[PDB]
Amino acid sequence: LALSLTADQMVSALLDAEPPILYSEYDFSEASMMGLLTNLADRELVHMINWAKRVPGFVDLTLHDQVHLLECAWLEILMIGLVWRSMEHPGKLLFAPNLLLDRNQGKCVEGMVEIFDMLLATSSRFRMMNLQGEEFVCLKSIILLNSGVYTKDHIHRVLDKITDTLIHLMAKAGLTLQQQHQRLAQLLLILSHIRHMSNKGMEHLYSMKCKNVVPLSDLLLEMLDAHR
Amino acid sequence: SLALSLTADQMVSALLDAEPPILYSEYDPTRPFSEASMMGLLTNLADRELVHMINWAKRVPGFVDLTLHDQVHLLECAWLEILMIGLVWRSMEHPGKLLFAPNLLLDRNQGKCVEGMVEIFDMLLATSSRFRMMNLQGEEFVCLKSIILLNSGVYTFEEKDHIHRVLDKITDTLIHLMAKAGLTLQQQHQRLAQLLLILSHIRHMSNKGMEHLYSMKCKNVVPLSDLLLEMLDAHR
Amino acid sequence: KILHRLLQD
Amino acid sequence: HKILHRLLQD
Ligand SMILES: O/N=C/c1c(O)ccc(-c2ccc(O)c(F)c2)c1Cl
Numbered sequence: 001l002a003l004s005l006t007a008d009q010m011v012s013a014l015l016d017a018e019p020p021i022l023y024s025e026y027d028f029s030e031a032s033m034m035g036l037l038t039n040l041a042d043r044e045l046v047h048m049i050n051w052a053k054r055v056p057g058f059v060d061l062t063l064h065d066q067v068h069l070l071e072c073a074w075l076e077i078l079m080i081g082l083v084w085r086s087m088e089h090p091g092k093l094l095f096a097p098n099l100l101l102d103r104n105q106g107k108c109v110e111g112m113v114e115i116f117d118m119l120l121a122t123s124s125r126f127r128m129m130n131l132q133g134e135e136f137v138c139l140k141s142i143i144l145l146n147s148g149v150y151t152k153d154h155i156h157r158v159l160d161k162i163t164d165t166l167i168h169l170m171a172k173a174g175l176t177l178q179q180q181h182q183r184l185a186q187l188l189l190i191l192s193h194i195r196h197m198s199n200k201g202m203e204h205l206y207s208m209k210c211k212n213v214v215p216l217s218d219l220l221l222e223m224l225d226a227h228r
Numbered sequence: 229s230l231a232l233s234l235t236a237d238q239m240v241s242a243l244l245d246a247e248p249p250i251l252y253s254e255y256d257p258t259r260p261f262s263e264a265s266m267m268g269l270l271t272n273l274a275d276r277e278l279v280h281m282i283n284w285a286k287r288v289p290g291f292v293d294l295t296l297h298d299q300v301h302l303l304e305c306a307w308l309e310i311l312m313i314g315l316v317w318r319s320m321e322h323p324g325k326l327l328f329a330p331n332l333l334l335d336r337n338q339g340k341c342v343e344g345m346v347e348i349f350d351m352l353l354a355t356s357s358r359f360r361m362m363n364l365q366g367e368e369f370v371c372l373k374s375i376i377l378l379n380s381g382v383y384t385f386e387e388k389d390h391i392h393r394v395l396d397k398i399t400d401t402l403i404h405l406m407a408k409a410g411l412t413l414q415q416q417h418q419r420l421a422q423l424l425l426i427l428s429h430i431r432h433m434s435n436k437g438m439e440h441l442y443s444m445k446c447k448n449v450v451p452l453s454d455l456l457l458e459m460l461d462a463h464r
Numbered sequence: 465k466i467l468h469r470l471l472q473d
Numbered sequence: 474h475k476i477l478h479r480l481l482q483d
């Protein structure tokens with residue numbers, strides 16, 4: 001089915017598949033904030049699973065491959081989402097509508113300010129590029145299918161389709177050929193930074209875990225243990 | 229800047245000529261491997277490569293235009309990625325093996341000699357396998373290595389605009405190479421994307437190798453050189 | 465694993 | 474300064 005969709009239908013499908021924006025249980029210590037972030041992430045994870053199943057090509061994969069891809073990519077996916085909805089709040093991270101944190105509230109947790117700064121710099125970059133919603137959804141699907149793919153032709157064929165869709169959107173927006181290729185590259189290089197940020201976030205989350213205090217859901221612990 | 233003025237062909241020429249040499253390890257075949265001694269080999273090798281990497285980065289168009297602090301930051305951020313993409317590249321024609329050096333060609337089973345290392349060998353091998361399947365070309369490899377140098381640290385920053393201009397030039401160069409090679413227009417954007425997506429995997433391996441290296445330091449497995457200690461501390 | 469169950473359901 | 478900082482000059 002995925003290989004048969006048009007560019008516009010790929011976009012329509014991904015837009016349709018988008019997960020809800022969730023609220024946190026907010027109403028400020030190292031523990032309370034982390035509880036908030038991990039509580040939010042756990043609930044987001046459940047909606048991410050439904051969304052993945054709606055990314056074209058993904059339900060074609062074995063359950064085992066679906067699990068591996070999600071285990072590798074879940075924090076990357078949460079983070080690009082966070083960056084996307086923070087785009088229009090310079091110097092702030094919109095974890096949720098009722099949880100808009102600035103770089104300084106990141107200092108409320110050891111090691112967290114550095115991660116916030118990377119998240120904020122990426123938001124700034126999206127803003128600089130005037131990243132579009134259609135492009136964002138494409139990039140998010142690329143993360144899902146790409147991050148764990150080396151650890152299969154079908155995945156790579158689907159990936160190429162999404163590249164075609166990105167280029168379609170850019171051509172439709174009036175960009176020259178040269179501009180399309182440059183922008184595609186700019187967009188994909190951000191995925192390097194998003195990988196970096198997930199790696200750092202994973203190590204952090206892991207430290208929080210061993211230190212007890214902040215309780216993580218069974219699901220979060222399991223996703224976490226797949227990276228160790 | 230003169231970098232922005234270079235043609236696609238001159239860009240490729242500059243990068244191919246700037247390529248560092250393949251170095252030998254201090255491997256001693258009179259002695260069996262231990263965890264310590266194998267880690268010693270890789271770190272001694274990385275240290276000697278770093279010096280050549282610095283000369284190389286100075287010849288990447290646009291890099292000399294940055295302040296010393298910017299050059300330091302980019303290299304601190306990308307050094308292990310740059311070492312690893314080179315490793316994967318030279319391992320290409322050795323399926324199932326990692327050519328750290330001509331005198332140090334290791335399979336995954338030798339990686340097991342160091343705790344937590346086999347996981348990393350497997351990722352490196354899978355990436356080499358991927359280069360092989362894509363039939364990555366030397367001209368593409370040099371472009372990708374230069375992209376890593378300029379990109380990895382770029383969002384940890386005016387001249388940031390300059391760097392992005394240079395990065396755009398390298399994109400034009402990649403496209404130029406693929407077209408020259410006869411790839412259709414669709415194939416060009418599809419390959420560009422396949423090539424850049426690999427940089428996400430390279431970043432992953434670098435982060436995992438950085439944590440592994442830090443582990444060996446803190447367990448006193450091997451003494452890292454002062455330069456290595458400095459590059460590492462930039463990540464902690 | 466919990467992820468298994470969520471994918472099926 | 475860093476060792477890296479000095480190598481960049483030499
Ligand atoms: O250790 N904390 C992990 C962490 C972090 O460092 C930064 C952000 C988040 C986070 C990112 C995106 C989210 O949607 C989220 F709900 C939490 C987490 Cl869980």
Ligand SMILES: O/N=C/c1c(O)ccc(-c2ccc(O)c(F)c2)c1Cl
Nearest residue numbers: 270273274311312315348437440441
């Ligand atoms: O402790 N881990 C560090 C590490 C690794 O896990 C894998 C490869 C290397 C390495 C990679 C590329 C090189 O050119 C090299 F000399 C070492 C290191 Cl230093």
